[PDB]
Amino acid sequence: ATKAVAVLKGDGPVQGIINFEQKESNGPVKVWGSAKGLTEGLHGFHVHGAGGDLGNVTADKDGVADVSIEDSVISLSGDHSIIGRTLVVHEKAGAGAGSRLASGVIGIAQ
Incomplete structure (x- = not known):
C-alpha cells in the first residue's frame, strides 16, 4: 500500500487516529498523528x-x-506487512507489561 489509517479506540476517553505513509516498496514508512484522553507520562506505542x-x-x-x-523497519507492502496488524498502546504510563490497552487494526487508505 501507499497509505493506511489506524483508528485508536480504548477504555473510555482514550481514542485516536494514526496515519501511515509509504512511497516505494522498501522505503521509510512515515507515521504521523495523535491520540487523546491519556494520563501524564510515557506510553508503550507499538x-x-x-x-x-x-x-x-x-x-x-x-x-x-x-x-x-x-520508519524504515515497518512496511506497507512486503512480507512483514503491517496492513491488518494491530497497533496497540499502553494506557498505563511507564514501564512493564501494560495490560489496559487501546487497539486499532491497520487498514488501507491508498
Whole structure:
C-alpha cells in the first residue's frame, strides 16, 4: 500500500487516529498523528506481531500525544506487512507489561 489509517479506540476517553505513509516498496514508512484522553507520562506505542515496535509517545498534561516518526523497519507492502496488524498502546504510563490497552487494526487508505 501507499497509505493506511489506524483508528485508536480504548477504555473510555482514550481514542485516536494514526496515519501511515509509504512511497516505494522498501522505503521509510512515515507515521504521523495523535491520540487523546491519556494520563501524564510515557506510553508503550507499538504494532502487534513480529517487527513493529515504535518506541514511545509523550502524553502531555492534557493526556494528548503528538506523533511524527519516520520508519524504515515497518512496511506497507512486503512480507512483514503491517496492513491488518494491530497497533496497540499502553494506557498505563511507564514501564512493564501494560495490560489496559487501546487497539486499532491497520487498514488501507491508498
